[PDB]
Design a protein around this ligand. Structure first.
Ligand SMILES: CC(=O)N[C@@H]1[C@@H](O)[C@H](O)[C@@H](CO)O[C@H]1O
Ligand SMILES: *[C@@H]1O[C@H](CO)[C@@H](O)[C@H](O)[C@H]1NC(C)=O
Length: 361
């Protein structure tokens, strides 16, 4: 079973204990660590942060401690034009330039492959996404002739039906990809004027505006679309999402004035790391949606949807039973990586609970 963990570039900048460098990653925790994100510049893969060459190097020396660890570099992200990606892929020359640039860059910096994170193709883009994956793989195949173990190619794929139908020819891209990380934790929109969980496993009985907005739909759907189970990796989040409440109403349907206030360390409205959530729980009322099998918490006018050890293990069982290829965790810097916040003296609590489950019979 694969355990694929994202590491994010910009976590280095967080104040105090929030600051995470690739140092702090336990090298036997994951099977693949993916570094996010790389830029594209002059139609070629490139560094984002001023010091990526160093961080890349810090990450790839984790391989000294664990020679089986695979690392990938992810290109794209959200800070990065979908429009910018589109431009590069929908033209034969710029697509060629990009593709030729990738293996030497990966080889130089000691990575084992590439993760495409185009978020997200438009309906005009679907055809070019397919050509790019195809052509990128054939390039990795042709470079394997020079003696080194073949570069892996993976892709990050949104878990909303609408976005999938729009941008992704799953049947086609699954053939050339080594795995697909399904992004099963963005199921509760911004437009929404109410509380809700963003990574529910099941739909849950109370009312279904969508019966599609849960991990299980998304998984069944990708299988139906023709991704083999053995290339599919289910995304499990390590963060929560917070909402400022609009009234004293707190349960299903409860109205919302907007996103919840910034976390002390992550400093971004609407999101908390798991280590900020562990502290938030002191003084909170906690509940579990029975149907959706994920928890939420609330205190003052703040309401948080999150994943805990129980829920994350539960998702890991689900994927085992479904015979998927593994889990994808977003992200290591948002787990309790110091191991000091969540009571028990355990570093990467969420990610280890998954790993532990992945190893069971
Ligand atoms: C700029 C910033 O600090 N916000 C990041 C956000 O970009 C990222 O999506 C999230 C999960 O990786 O972690 C937050 O801390
Ligand atoms: C990424 O590359 C673009 C296109 O070349 C460039 O103009 C931009 O400044 C780069 N972004 C960063 C953060 O380096």
């Amino acid at each position: 079973y694969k355990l694929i963990c994202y590491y994010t570039s910009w976590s280095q900048y967080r104040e105090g204990d929030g600051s995470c460098f690739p140092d702090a990653i336990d090298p036997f925790l994951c099977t693949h660590v993916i570094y996010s994100f790389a830029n594209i510049s002059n139609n070629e893969i490139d560094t984002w942060e001023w010091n990526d060459v160093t961080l890349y190097d810090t990450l790839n020396t984790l391989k000294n401690r664990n020679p089986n660890l695979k690392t990938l570099l992810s290109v794209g992200g959200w800070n990065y034009g979908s429009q910018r990606f589109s431009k590069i892929a929908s033209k034969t020359q710029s697509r060629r330039t990009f593709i030729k640039s990738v293996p030497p860059f990966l080889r130089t910096h000691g990575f084992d492959g590439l993760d495409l994170a185009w978020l997200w193709p438009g309906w005009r883009d679907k055809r070019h996404l397919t050509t790019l994956v195809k052509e990128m793989k054939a390039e990795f195949v042709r470079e394997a002739q020079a003696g080194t173990e073949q570069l892996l190619l993976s892709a990050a794929v949104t878990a909303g039906k609408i976005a999938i139908d729009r941008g992704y020819d799953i049947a086609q891209i699954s053939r050339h990809l080594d795995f697909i990380s399904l992004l099963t934790y963005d199921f509760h929109g911004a437009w929404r004027q109410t509380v809700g969980h963003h990574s529910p496993l099941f739909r849950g009985n109370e009312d279904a505006s969508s019966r599609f907005s849960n991990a299980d739909y998304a998984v069944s759907y990708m299988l139906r679309l023709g991704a083999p189970a053995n290339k599919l990796v289910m995304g499990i989040p390590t963060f929560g999402r917070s909402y400022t409440l609009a009234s004293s109403k707190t349960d299903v349907g409860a109205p919302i004035s907007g996103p919840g206030i910034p976390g002390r360390f992550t400093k971004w409205k609407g999101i908390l790391a798991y280590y900020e959530i562990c502290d938030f729980l002191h003084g909170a009322t906690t509940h579990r949606f029975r149907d959706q099998q994920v928890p939420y918490a609330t205190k003052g006018n703040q309401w948080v949807a999150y994943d805990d050890q129980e829920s994350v293990k539960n998702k890991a069982r689900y994927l085992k039973n479904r015979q998927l290829a593994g889990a994808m965790v977003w992200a290591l810097d948002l787990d309790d990586f110091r191991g000091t916040f969540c009571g028990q003296n355990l570093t990467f609590p969420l990610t280890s609970a998954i790993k532990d489950v992945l190893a069971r019979v």
